[PDB]
Design a protein around this ligand. Structure first.
Ligand code: PC1
Ligand code: PC1
Ligand code: AMP
Lengths: 459, 55, 47, 347, 120, 98, 320, 64, 140, 101, 49
C-alpha cells in the first residue's frame, strides 16, 4: 500500500510549499490523480485477497471504502474552500494538512492486517477530527462537541485494546490472515461475555448504537462541512470494519447474546426516524437519519448472514455518499441564509431550480428508490432480517413508512411553498457548488449499473 | 423525554456530577501541616494494624 | 455569522481560584502575579 | 544567587543522585539522600519569598520523616540480616518502613499532601528540578529491592495515586498544581508495573521526564504561571500554541503520540500476568487525566482568548530567553511511537 | 530482566558479542525516520526563534540531522544486540530443559472433534 | 530478640507519634525528630556492640553527624519564618492553599 | 547574545565600570517647565547623554528602521483626541497613559542597561517613579474610574519592586499661571484645552505624596523656574552633593549582575505589563487582535527577527 | 431563534427529576424494549424447537 | 481486615442469615471508621462532640449499608434458591443504594447508587465464580 | 465603558458584483477559470468516464464468469456418466475417522 | 542599513558555523569509519567472505 501512502505523504509538502493563491487548485488536482490511481486496488480474486505485504492487505470489503475515502477528500476540499477565504494562509494550510493527515490515517486504518495496528491508527484518526471540530466550527457548542465526541469513543475502546492485547497473549498473533485459520470457538461464560462486551462496545459507540448516539447530533450542527462530510460518510464506517474484522473471533457466543443490541437498534431506529419527523434543523435531521441507517447496519452485521453482509456493505457506501451530499445541500442553504432553521427559507424552487433538482435527487436516493444501491443494500438487509425472524418485518415496515415521510417533508418545506418575502440574498448557482453536487451524485447513480464491486467480501 | 433528558442523564451527566463532587471533596484542603501529618499517622496505623501488610 | 470567540464572561469563568467554587473556597483569593507576598526598652537605672 | 555557588549546589545534588545510583551500601544510600535534600533546599529559596519558605518547611519536614523511616528500615534489615548489601530485604516490616519512606519521598498518595504546595510555592525551574530529578533516586532504590516489595501494598498505593491525582487535577486552575497532580498520576502508572517488569517502569519514567521537562520548558519560555496568561500566549506567538497543543495532547495518552507508547505497553506487561480489571481502572483514570488536559488545551490553543493592548509592545522584541534543547525534547515527546522497540536498550 | 546478563560486566554499551552481529545498514528505514526527526527539530528551531523556516541556518539543520542519525544508529545497534541476546537465551534454555517442555503431535482434521453452531 | 531493643524501638515510635501529631510549634517537632534520631543511633550502636562488628562502628556517629547536618538546617528554616511571621506557629503556616 | 552568568564567572564586574561620573539623573516637573533642554543641558557638559522623553512611539524608534509606527500597529491611542475630549467612552486616555507607562519602563530599562554596561551616567526625563501623579490628575477630573486605577497600581506594584531609584532627581517649580500662559503661547491648536484643575492637581499630588517618598530613596533638588534657565548653578549643585541616600551603596556585584540579567531581556521587563486583569478600556477583540497581528507581520522588517529579513537587504541568512 | 433555542437547548437546564418525569421516562424507555425482547425471544425458541425436530418445512430454503 | 472478607466468604451464600449480615456489618463498620478517621484528619471538626458525631454518623451509615446488603443477599438467595446467581447481589446492591439514599436524604443518589454498587456486587460475584484476581501475582 | 473593543462583524461578501463571471472559487478571474478547468477536466473527463471504462472491462471480477465455465464443464461430465449433480457430502465420506458413540 | 542598531545575529559569525561544519564532518567521518570497522569485523568474526 506504499503506492498510495507515499503520494499522500508527498502531497503533504505540496500543500506546504504551494503559493498563496494556488493551494486549492494544486491540492484538488493531485488528490484527483490519487483518486484515479486508487482504482488499481480492484485486482480481486474469488478466493484470495490482494495481500500486498506483511502488514498491508485489502480484500473485496475494504477496497470500496478506500476508493470512497480518497474520492471524498477532493469533495471536502471543494466544500470547505469558501468560508476559509478570509482565514489566514498558514491556518488554511493547517486545515488542508489536517484533512490530508485524516485521509492518510483512514487509508492506513482499512488496510491494517494486524488488529493492533488497526486500533492504533483507528484512533489516531481521533486527533484531526477533534481539532477540526473544535477549531473551525461556528458556534459555542463546538467546545461541548469536542467532549461528547471524544469521551464517548475512547471510553468504548480503552477496554477493547486490553481485550486485543489479551488475544495477543492467547492466540499468539492478532494478524487477520492467521486468525482465519487459528480461530477457536468461544464458550459460554461470564469472562467470554465481558470479552464480547469489550470487543463490541467501541464500535457500538462508533456506529453509534441507540442510547450511545448523543455524540452524533451535537457534533454535526456546528462543524465545518469538511468535518461534517468526513464524520457522516467515512468516519462512521470504522464501526462496520470493526464488525467485519472482529466478529470472526466472537463465535458462537454472538448468536445468543446480541438480542438486546438488536432490540435497542431496531426500536432506536424507529425512535430516531420519529425524531426526524419532528426536527427544526437540517443538520440534526440528517444526523438522526444517519443514526437510523447505522442502527440498520448494526442489525445487519449482528445477524451475520451472507445476504446481510452484502446489504450492510452496500447500505454503508450508499448512505455515506447520500449523507455527504445531503450535508452539502444543508451547507449551501446555510451559506445563503446564514441560519439552520428549516422553516425560515422556504419555496426555493421558485428561485433556485438546479438546487431543487439536486434536492429531489437527494430525497429520492435517501428513501431507497430502486434500482439505486441504497435500495439494494436496504432490501438485502430487509430479507436477512426477515430470515432471522418473521415479526422483524413489522418493526421494519413502519420505519420504511417513516423514512419516506420525513425524507420528502425535509425537501418540501425547504423547496415548495410561498417563498419568504424578507429574504433577498439568494444568489444563483455557483459553478463550484453544482460541480461538487454532481460529483457527489453521478457515482451514486453509476454504481447501480455495476453493483458487484461494492457487494462485500463474499459476493 | 428520552433523547434529550434521560439518555443524556444516565450515562454522561451522572458521571460528570459524580466526578464534580469527588474532585470538590478531594481538593478542599486547608493547607495545615498538622492535619497532613495526622493523616500520615492514621494512614500508617491503618496499613500496619487493619490491613496487616507484614504477613 | 462568523466564528464565535470567547468573551470576558468565559475568561472570568476560567479566572477563579478553583475550577468549581464550592462552599469553602469562597474567600480563596488568587495568588499574586509577581509571586511576591518591638525593640527592647531597657532602663539603665540609678542603682 | 551567586553563579559559582549555584553551580556548586547543582553539582552537589547531581553528586547525591549519583551516589544513590552507584553505591552498594545502605549508609551511602542514606548519605546520598541527605545530600540530595540539603542541595535541593536552597534551590527553592532562590527568590526569598514567604511562599518559598512555607514550601521549603513542608518539603524539609516530609523528607526528614521519610529519611528517619528509611533509617529505621535499614537498621531493622541490619539487625535481622547482619550486612549492608543493597539487595532483597530480610524482613516484611523493614520492607513496610522502606516502602513508606520511598512513597513519602516520591509524593505517592496518600502521602501526596506535600507535592502541590511545594510545586506552587517555588519557581518554574525549581519545579522542573524537583519533579524531574527527585524521581530518579527513589526509583533506583525501588528497582534494587523489588524482590522484597509486598504486592498488595504497592498496587494499592499505585491505584490510590492515579485516582487521587486525577481527582485533584480536575479542580485546579494554577498550572503548578496541575503539574503536581499529573505527576502523581504518572507516578501511579509507573509504579503499578514495577513488580511485573521494571523495564516498563524505567521506560515510563524516561518518557514522563521528557514530557514534563518539555512542558516546564514551554512554561519557562512563555513566562506563564496561570491559565489566563497561557490563553493570552496566542497573540504573542502561534507556534507556542501549536507546541503546547501537541505536547498536552501527547501527555493525554492519544495515538500516534509518544505518550501512548509507555502506558499501552504497561497493559502489555499486565495482561501477561492475567491482571485485567486493574489496567482497565487505570485507563479510566487516565481518561480523567485526559479530561483535565483537554480542558487546559481548550483554554490555551483551540480557542483564542481576548488580549490586551500592551502586548503590541511585546511584538517588537523577539524571545531572547534560552530554551534548553526545546525542539529535541518536543520531538521526543511527540513522535516517538514508530521507534517503540527502542525500550530494549533499557534491559 | 536481562540484568543477570548485565551482571558480571557492567556499563557496557556494546559488549564483545555485539561486534559479531550484522550492523544496521545506512539505508535502514528507522535511521531515515530518525533523520526526519532531526530535520523536524531543525525546522522547529527555525520556527520558534522567528526565523525563516526552510533556509535559515543550514549548519544547524545539518548538525541536528547528523547528531540524530549518530545516536539513532548506536541505539539501534544496542536494540538489535539486546533482541539477539533475548533469542539466544531463549534457544539456550529451550535446549537445556526438554523435560518441562515436551513435543506435540499435531492431529489431522479427519478425527479431531469440533462442534458446529448453526447461524440462522 | 531482647528487652532493651524493645524499649528503644518503642521510644522511637513514641517520638514518631509525637512528631506526627503537632502541637502548634515547629521547633518542638524538630526536637521530636532529633529524639527519633537518638533512638535510631542508640539502636544501631547497641546492635553493633552486641554483634562485635568493629568495622561498621563508623556508621552510628556518622549517622549522628549527618543528622546535625540537617538539624541546623531546620533551625535555619525557623528564623526565616520568624523573619516573616512574628512567631513560629504551624497554624499560621497555611498561606499555600490557593 | 552578549552577557550572561558565564561573563560574571569570567570576571565582568559592573562596579569596576561605575566611577564618580556614573550618576543616574532624571528631570521631571510640570507640562511646560522648560526642562526640555535642561536635562539635555546636563547631557552636553557632564560627559553624559540624554534620551528624549518616552513618547507614544519611542519603541517604534528604538527598534526597526527607527521610523515611528502608525497608530494601529503601536498604541491604538491618541494624545490629541485625549486633549480634545478626555471623557470619551472608549477610554482612550487610559490607553494612552498605559502606553506611555510601558514606554517609560522600556526607556528606564535601556538607561539602566547603558549604565550597567558602560559605566556612564544617563540623563532621563520623567522616570517611572514620577508617572503615576499624572494618573492622579486623571482621577481628579473624573476622567477614569476606580478599577483602572486599581489595575495601574497592580501593574506598578508588580513591575517596580525589582528596580532602583536614580541618583539625583531635578524638579523645576513653575506656577500654574505662568505655565498656562506658556501653553497659550505654544501655538499648537491641539493643546488649547488644558484645564487649570489639571495642573493644580498635578502640583498638589506632586508636592503632597511624591516628595515625602522620593526624598529618602534618592536626592531631590527643588529648583525654580527663573533659575532653571541658570545651568551653572544646577551643575554646581550636581557636582557638590553627597551620595549617601538611597539603596545605591548596598549593591554589590552579584545584585547588579542579577539586575543586568533581568534588564537586558526586554520581555522579562514587559512580562507583567499585560497582566490578565480584564478591563473594558484595555481589552482588544480577538478578531481585531488577529487582524492587527497579521498586519504587523507584513510590515517590512517585522516578519522575522532583526537580522533575518530578505526584504530589507540582509545577506548570508542561509549561513545565519 | 428564541423558539429554536427553547426547543432543544433549554430542556435539560430547567429539568428536575421527580416522580412524573422519571415514571414517564421509565415507562417509555424500557417498556417497549422489554416487550419486543420477549416477543422476539419466544419466537426464537419456537422457531428453534420447530427446526431441530424437522417439523419446519425447509425444502427449498438454501438462500439465507 | 484480611480475616473479615475471608470470614464473609467462608460461609456458603444464602444458607445462614445473621452471621453473614453481621460479617457484612463489621466490614462496613471498619470502612466507616477508616473514612471517618480520614474525614476528621483532613477536615478539622469544630469540636470534639461534633467530631465524634460525624464519626458515629459515618459508622452508622456504613454499618446500615453493609447490614442491608448482606440481609438482602441472604433472603434473595434463599427465596430464589440459587447460590451461584449474581442477580441476588444486584438486588442487594440496589437495597444498599436505597439505604444510602435514605440516610443521605436523596432519591437520584439512591437510584445511581442502586445501579453502581449493584454492578459492583455483580462484578464481585462473577469475580468469585470465575476466579478473577484484583492483585495478580507475578508469573512472567 | 464598552467591553472588549472589537471590530464590527463583517457583512456577507457577495461575489457577483465585482465579478459577474465568477464560478465561486476566488476573486481573481484567471484563478477561477483555471480552478474550474482543473476540476472539470480531472474530475469528470478523467476519473468518471475512464473509471467507468476501467470497471466495465475489468478482467473477470472474482473469476465469476470462470465460475460459469468450469461449472459448464462439470455437469457436462456428470450428466454423461449417470453421476448425481451434487452430493450431500462435501468431502469424501470414506476419508474421515468418525468419533466414537 | 535598515535597523537603527546592529543586531547580534545580523552578522555571520564564521567561527561558530565553521565549528558546526567541522563537528558535522567529524561525526559523519567517524560514522562511516565505524560502520566499515563493524562490517569487516563481522565478516572476520564469521568467515562469510
Ligand atoms: C462507553 C462506556 C462503557 C464501556 C463498556 C465496555 C464493555 C464493558 C466491559 C469492559 C471490561 C474491561 C475489559 C475486559 C477485557 C477482558 C478480556 C478477557 O479475556 O477477559 C477474560 C478475563 C477472565 O480472567 P482471566 O482470563 O485472567 O482468567 C483465566 C481464565 N479463567 C477464568 C478460566 C481462570 O476476565 C477478567 O479478568 C474480568 C473481565 C471483566 C472486567 C470487569 C471490570 C471492568 C468493568 C467495565 C468498565 C468499563 C469502563 C467504565 C468507565 C468508562 C469511562 C467513564
Ligand atoms: C466504488 C466505491 C466508492 C464509491 C465512490 C467511487 C468514486 C470513483 C468513481 C469512479 C467512476 C465511476 C466508477 C463506477 C462506474 C459504474 C458504471 C459502469 O462503468 O458500469 C459498467 C457496466 C458494464 O456492463 P456489464 O457489466 O454488463 O458488461 C460486462 C463486461 N463486458 C463488456 C466485458 C462483457 O456498464 C453498463 O452496464 C453500461 C450499460 C450501457 C449504458 C446504459 C444504457 C441505458 C441508459 C439508460 C436508458 C434509459 C433507461 C430508462 C430510464 C427511465 C427513467 C429513470
Ligand atoms: N502620563 C501622562 N499623562 C498625561 N499626559 C502626559 C503623560 N506623560 C506625558 N504627558 C504629556 O507629555 C508632554 C510632555 O512634553 P514636554 O511638554 O516636552 O514636557 C506634556 O504635554 C504632558 O502633559
Amino acid at each position: 500500500m506504499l503506492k498510495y501512502i507515499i503520494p499522500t505523504m508527498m502531497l503533504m509538502p505540496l500543500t506546504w510549499l504551494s503559493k498563496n493563491s494556488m493551494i486549492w487548485i494544486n491540492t484538488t488536482l493531485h488528490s484527483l490523480l490519487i483518486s484515479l490511481t486508487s482504482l488499481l486496488l480492484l485486482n480481486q480474486f474469488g478466493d484470495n485477497s490482494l495481500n500486498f505485504s506483511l502488514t498491508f492487505f485489502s480484500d473485496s470489503l475494504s477496497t470500496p471504502l478506500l476508493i470512497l475515502t480518497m474520492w471524498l477528500l477532493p469533495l471536502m476540499l471543494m466544500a470547505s474552500q469558501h468560508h476559509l477565504s478570509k482565514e489566514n494562509l498558514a491556518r488554511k494550510k493547517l486545515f488542508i494538512s489536517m484533512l490530508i493527515l485524516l485521509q492518510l490515517f483512514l487509508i492506513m486504518t482499512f488496510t491494517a492486517t494486524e488488529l493492533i495496528f488497526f486500533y492504533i491508527m483507528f484512533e489516531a484518526t481521533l486527533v484531526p477530527t477533534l481539532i477540526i471540530i473544535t477549531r473551525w466550527g461556528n458556534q459555542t457548542e463546538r467546545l461541548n462537541a469536542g467532549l461528547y465526541f471524544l469521551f464517548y469513543t475512547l471510553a468504548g475502546s480503552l477496554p477493547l485494546l486490553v481485550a486485543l492485547i489479551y488475544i495477543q497473549n492467547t492466540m499468539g498473533s492478532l494478524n487477520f490472515l492467521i486468525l482465519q485459520y487459528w480461530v477457536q470457538p468461544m464458550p459460554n461464560s461470564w469472562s467470554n461475555t465481558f470479552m464480547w462486551l469489550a470487543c463490541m462496545m467501541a464500535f457500538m459507540v462508533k456506529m453509534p448504537l441507540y442510547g450511545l448516539h448523543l455524540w452524533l447530533p451535537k457534533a454535526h450542527v456546528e462543524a465545518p462541512i469538511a468535518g461534517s462530510m468526513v464524520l457522516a460518510a467515512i468516519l462512521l464506517k470504522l464501526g462496520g470494519y470493526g464488525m467485519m474484522r472482529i466478529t470472526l473471533l466472537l463465535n458462537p457466543i454472538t448468536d445468543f447474546m446480541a438480542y438486546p443490541f438488536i432490540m435497542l437498534s431496531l426500536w432506536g431506529m424507529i425512535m430516531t426516524s420519529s425524531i426526524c419527523l419532528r426536527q427544526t434543523d437540517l443538520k440534526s435531521l440528517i444526523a438522526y437519519s444517519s443514526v437510523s441507517h447505522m442502527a440498520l447496519v448494526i442489525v445487519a452485521i449482528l445477524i451475520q448472514t451472507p445476504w446481510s453482509y452484502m446489504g450492510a456493505t452496500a447500505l454503508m457506501i450508499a448512505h455515506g455518499l447520500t449523507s455527504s451530499m445531503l450535508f452539502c445541500l444543508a451547507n449551501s442553504n446555510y451559506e445563503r441564509v446564514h441560519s439552520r432553521t428549516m422553516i425560515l427559507a422556504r419555496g426555493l424552487q421558485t428561485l433556485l431550480p438546479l438546487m431543487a433538482a439536486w434536492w429531489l435527487l437527494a430525497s429520492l436516493t435517501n428513501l431507497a428508490l430502486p434500482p439505486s444501491i441504497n435500495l439494494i443494500g436496504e432490501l438485502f438487509v430487509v430479507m436477512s432480517t426477515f430470515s432471522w425472524s418473521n415479526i422483524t418485518i413489522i418493526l421494519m415496515g413502519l420505519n420504511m413508512v417513516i423514512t419516506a415521510l420525513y425524507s420528502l417533508y425535509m425537501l418540501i418545506t425547504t423547496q415548495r411553498g410561498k417563498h419568504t418575502h424578507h429574504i433577498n440574498n439568494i444568489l444563483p448557482s455557483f459553478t463550484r457548488e453544482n460541480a461538487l453536487m454532481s460529483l457527489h451524485m453521478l457515482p451514486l447513480l453509476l454504481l447501480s449499473l455495476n453493483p458487484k464491486i461494492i457487494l462485500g467480501p463474499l459476493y | 423525554l428520552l433523547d434529550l433528558i434521560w439518555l443524556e442523564t444516565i450515562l454522561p451527566k451522572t458521571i460528570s456530577l459524580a466526578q464534580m463532587k469527588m474532585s470538590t471533596t478531594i481538593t478542599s484542603q486547608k493547607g495545615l501541616i498538622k492535619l497532613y501529618f495526622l493523616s500520615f499517622l492514621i494512614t500508617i496505623l491503618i496499613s500496619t494494624t487493619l490491613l496487616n501488610f507484614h504477613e | 455569522a462568523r466564528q464565535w470567540q470567547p468573551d470576558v464572561e468565559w475568561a472570568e469563568q476560567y479566572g477563579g481560584a478553583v475550577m468549581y467554587p464550592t462552599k469553602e473556597t469562597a474567600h480563596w483569593k488568587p495568588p499574586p502575579w509577581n509571586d511576591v507576598d518591638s525593640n527592647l526598652t531597657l532602663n539603665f537605672g540609678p542603682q | 544567587m551567586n553563579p559559582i555557588i549555584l553551580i556548586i549546589i547543582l553539582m552537589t545534588v547531581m553528586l547525591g543522585t549519583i551516589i544513590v545510583m552507584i553505591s552498594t551500601h545502605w549508609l551511602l544510600i542514606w548519605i546520598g539522600f541527605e545530600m540530595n535534600m540539603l542541595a535541593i533546599i536552597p534551590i527553592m529559596m532562590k527568590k526569598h519569598n514567604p511562599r518559598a519558605t512555607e514550601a521549603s518547611t513542608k518539603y524539609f519536614l516530609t523528607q526528614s520523616t521519610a529519611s528517619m523511616l528509611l533509617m529505621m528500615a535499614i537498621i531493622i534489615n541490619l539487625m535481622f540480616s547482619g550486612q549492608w548489601t543493597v539487595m532483597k530485604l530480610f524482613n516484611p516490616m523493614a520492607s513496610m518502613l522502606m516502602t513508606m519512606a520511598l512513597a513519602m519521598k516520591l509524593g505517592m498518595a496518600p502521602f501526596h499532601f506535600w507535592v502541590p504546595e511545594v510545586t506552587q510555592g517555588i519557581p518554574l525551574s525549581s519545579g522542573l528540578i524537583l519533579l524531574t530529578w527527585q524521581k530518579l533516586a527513589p526509583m533506583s532504590v525501588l528497582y534494587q529491592i523489588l524482590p522484597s516489595i509486598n504486592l498488595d501494598l504497592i498496587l494499592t498505593l499505585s491505584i490510590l495515586s492515579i485516582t487521587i491525582g486525577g481527582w485533584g487535577g480536575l479542580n485546579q486552575t494554577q498550572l503548578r498544581k496541575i503539574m503536581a497532580y499529573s505527576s502523581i498520576a504518572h507516578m501511579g502508572w509507573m509504579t503499578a508495573v514495577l513488580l511485573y517488569n521494571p523495564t516498563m517502569t524505567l521506560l515510563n519514567l524516561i518518557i514522563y521526564i521528557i514530557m514534563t521537562s518539555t512542558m516546564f520548558t514551554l512554561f519557562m519560555a512563555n513566562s506563564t504561571t496561570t491559565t489566563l496568561s497561557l490563553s493570552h500566549t496566542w497573540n504573542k506567538a502561534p507556534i507556542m500554541t501549536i507546541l503546547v497543543l501537541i505536547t498536552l495532547l501527547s501527555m493525554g495518552g492519544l495515538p500516534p503520540l509518544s505518550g501512548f507508547m509507555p502506558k499501552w505497553m504497561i497493559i502489555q506487561e499486565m495482561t501477561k500476568n492475567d491482571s485485567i480489571i486493574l489496567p482497565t481502572l487505570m485507563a479510566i483514570t487516565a481518561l480523567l487525566n485526559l479530561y483535565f488536559y483537554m480542558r487546559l488545551t481548550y483554554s490555551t490553543a483551540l480557542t483564542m482568548f481576548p488580549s490586551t493592548n500592551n502586548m503590541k509592545m511585546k511584538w517588537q522584541f523577539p524571545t531572547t530567553k534560552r530554551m534548553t534543547l526545546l525542539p529535541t525534547m518536543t520531538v521526543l515527546s511527540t513522535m516517538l511511537l514508530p521507534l517503540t522497540p527502542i525500550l530494549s536498550i533499557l534491559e | 530482566m536481562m540484568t543477570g546478563r548485565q551482571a558480571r560486566a557492567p556499563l557496557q554499551f556494546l559488549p564483545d558479542e555485539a561486534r559479531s552481529l550484522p550492523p544496521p545498514k545506512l539505508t535502514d528505514p528507522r535511521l531515515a525516520y530518525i533523520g526526519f526527526l532531526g530535520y523536524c527539530s531543525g525546522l522547529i528551531d527555525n520556527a520558534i526563534r522567528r526565523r525563516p523556516v526552510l533556509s535559515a541556518g543550514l549548519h544547524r539543520q545539518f548538525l541536528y540531522i547528523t547528531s540524530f542519525v549518530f545516536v539513532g544508529y548506536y541505539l539501534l545497534k544496542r536494540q538489535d544486540y539486546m533482541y539477539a541476546v533475548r533469542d539466544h537465551d531463549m534457544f539456550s534454555y529451550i535446549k537445556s530443559h526438554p523435560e518441562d517442555f515436551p513435543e506435540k503431535d499435531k492431529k489431522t482434521y479427519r478425527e479431531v472433534f469440533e462442534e458446529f453452531h448453526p447461524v440462522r | 530478640m531482647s528487652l532493651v531493643y524493645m524499649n528503644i524501638m518503642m521510644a522511637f515510635t513514641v517520638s514518631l507519634t509525637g512528631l506526627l501529631m503537632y502541637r502548634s510549634h515547629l521547633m518542638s517537632s524538630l526536637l521530636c525528630l532529633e529524639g527519633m534520631m537518638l533512638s535510631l543511633f542508640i539502636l544501631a550502636t547497641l546492635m553493633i556492640l552486641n554483634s562485635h562488628f568493629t568495622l561498621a562502628s563508623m556508621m552510628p556517629i556518622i549517622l549522628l553527624v549527618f543528622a546535625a547536618c540537617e538539624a541546623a538546617l531546620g533551625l535555619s528554616l525557623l528564623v526565616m519564618v520568624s523573619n516573616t511571621y512574628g512567631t513560629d506557629y504551624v497554624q499560621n503556616l497555611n498561606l499555600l492553599q490557593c | 547574545l552578549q552577557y550572561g552568568p558565564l561573563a560574571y564567572i569570567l570576571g565582568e564586574k559592573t562596579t569596576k565600570k561605575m566611577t564618580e561620573n556614573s550618576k543616574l539623573i532624571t528631570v521631571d516637573g510640570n507640562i511646560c517647565s522648560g526642562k526640555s533642554k535642561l536635562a539635555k543641558e546636563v547631557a552636553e557638559k557632564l560627559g553624559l547623554k540624554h534620551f528624549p522623553e518616552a513618547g507614544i512611539h519611542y519603541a517604534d524608534s528604538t527598534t526597526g528602521d527607527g521610523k515611528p509606527l502608525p497608530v494601529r500597529f503601536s498604541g491604538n491611542c491618541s494624545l490629541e483626541k485625549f486633549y480634545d475630549d478626555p471623557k470619551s467612552n472608549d477610554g482612550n486616555s487610559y490607553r494612552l497613559q498605559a502606553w506611555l507607562y510601558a514606554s517609560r519602563l522600556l526607556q528606564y530599562a535601556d538607561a539602566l542597561e547603558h549604565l550597567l554596561s558602560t559605566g556612564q551616567g544617563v540623563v532621563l526625563e520623567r522616570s517611572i517613579y514620577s508617572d503615576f501623579v499624572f494618573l492622579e490628575a486623571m482621577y481628579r477630573q473624573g476622567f477614569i474610574r476606580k478599577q483602572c486605577v486599581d489595575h495601574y497600581n497592580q501593574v506598578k506594584k508588580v513591575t517596580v519592586c525589582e528596580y532602583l531609584p536614580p541618583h539625583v532627581v531635578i524638579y523645576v517649580d513653575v506656577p500654574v499661571s505662568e505655565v498656562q500662559s506658556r501653553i497659550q503661547k505654544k501655538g499648537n491648536p491641539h493643546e488649547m484645552k488644558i484645564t487649570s484643575a489639571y495642573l493644580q492637581d498635578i502640583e498638589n499630588v506632586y508636592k503632597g505624596t511624591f516628595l515625602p517618598e522620593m526624598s529618602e530613596k534618592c536626592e531631590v533638588l527643588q529648583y525654580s523656574a527663573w533659575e532653571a534657565e541658570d545651568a551653572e548653578k544646577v551643575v554646581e549643585d550636581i557636582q557638590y552633593l553627597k551620595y549617601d541616600k538611597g539603596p545605591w551603596l548596598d549593591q554589590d556585584d552579584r545584585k547588579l549582575h542579577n539586575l543586568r540579567m533581568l534588564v537586558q531581556d526586554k520581555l522579562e521587563v514587559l512580562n507583567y505589563t499585560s497582566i490578565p486583569v480584564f478591563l473594558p478600556e484595555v481589552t482588544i477583540g480577538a478578531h481585531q487582535s488577529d487582524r492587527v497581528f497579521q498586519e504587523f507581520t507584513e510590515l517590512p522588517g517585522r516578519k522575522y527577527r532583526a537580522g533575518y529579513n530578505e526584504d530589507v537587504g540582509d545577506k548570508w541568512i542561509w549561513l545565519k | 431563534i428564541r423558539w429554536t433555542c427553547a426547543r432543544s437547548a433549554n430542556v435539560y437546564p430547567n429539568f428536575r427529576p421527580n416522580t412524573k418525569t422519571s415514571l414517564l421516562g421509565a415507562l417509555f424507555g424500557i417498556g417497549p424494549l422489554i416487550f419486543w425482547y420477549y416477543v422476539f425471544k419466544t419466537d426464537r425458541d419456537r422457531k428453534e424447537k420447530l427446526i431441530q425436530e424437522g417439523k419446519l418445512d425447509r425444502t427449498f430454503n438454501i438462500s439465507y | 481486615a484480611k480475616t473479615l472478607l475471608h470470614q464473609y466468604w467462608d460461609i456458603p451464600e444464602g444458607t445462614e442469615c445473621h452471621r453473614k449480615t453481621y460479617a457484612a456489618t463489621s466490614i462496613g463498620g471498619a470502612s466507616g471508621l477508616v473514612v471517618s478517621a480520614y474525614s476528621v484528619a483532613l477536615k478539622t471538626p469544630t469540636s470534639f462532640l461534633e467530631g465524634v458525631a460525624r464519626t458515629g454518623r459515618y459508622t452508622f451509615t456504613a454499618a446500615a449499608i453493609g447490614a442491608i446488603f448482606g440481609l438482602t443477599s441472604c433472603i434473595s438467595a434463599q427465596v430464589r434458591e440459587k447460590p451461584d446467581d449474581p442477580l441476588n447481589y444486584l438486588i442487594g446492591g440496589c437495597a444498599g443504594g436505597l439505604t444510602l439514599g435514605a440516610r443521605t436524604r436523596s432519591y437520584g443518589i439512591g437510584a445511581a447508587a442502586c445501579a453502581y454498587m449493584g454492578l459492583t456486587a455483580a462484578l464481585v460475584k462473577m469475580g468469585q465464580l470465575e476466579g478473577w484476581k484484583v492483585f495478580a501475582e507475578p508469573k512472567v | 465603558t464598552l467591553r472588549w473593543q472589537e471590530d464590527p462583524e463583517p457583512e456577507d461578501e457577495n461575489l457577483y458584483e465585482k465579478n459577474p463571471d465568477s464560478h465561486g472559487y476566488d476573486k481573481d478571474p484567471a484563478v477561477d477559470v483555471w480552478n474550474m478547468r482543473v476540476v472539470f477536466f480531472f474530475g469528470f473527463s478523467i476519473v468518471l468516464v475512464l473509471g467507468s471504462t476501467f470497471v466495465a472491462y475489468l478482467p473477470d471480477y472474482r473469476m465469476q464468469e470462470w465460475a460459469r465455465r468450469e461449472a459448464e464443464r462439470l455437469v457436462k461430465y456428470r450428466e454423461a456418466h449417470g453421476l448425481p449433480l451434487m452430493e450431500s457430502n462435501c468431502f469424501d465420506p470414506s476419508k474421515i475417522q468418525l468419533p466414537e458413540d | 542599513k535598515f535597523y537603527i542598531q546592529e543586531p547580534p545575529h545580523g552578522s555571520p559569525n564564521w567561527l561558530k558555523v565553521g565549528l558546526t561544519l567541522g563537528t558535522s564532518a567529524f561525526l559523519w567521518i567517524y560514522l562511516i569509519k565505524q560502520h566499515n570497522e563493524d562490517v569487516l569485523e563481522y565478516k572476520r568474526r564469521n568467515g562469510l567472505e
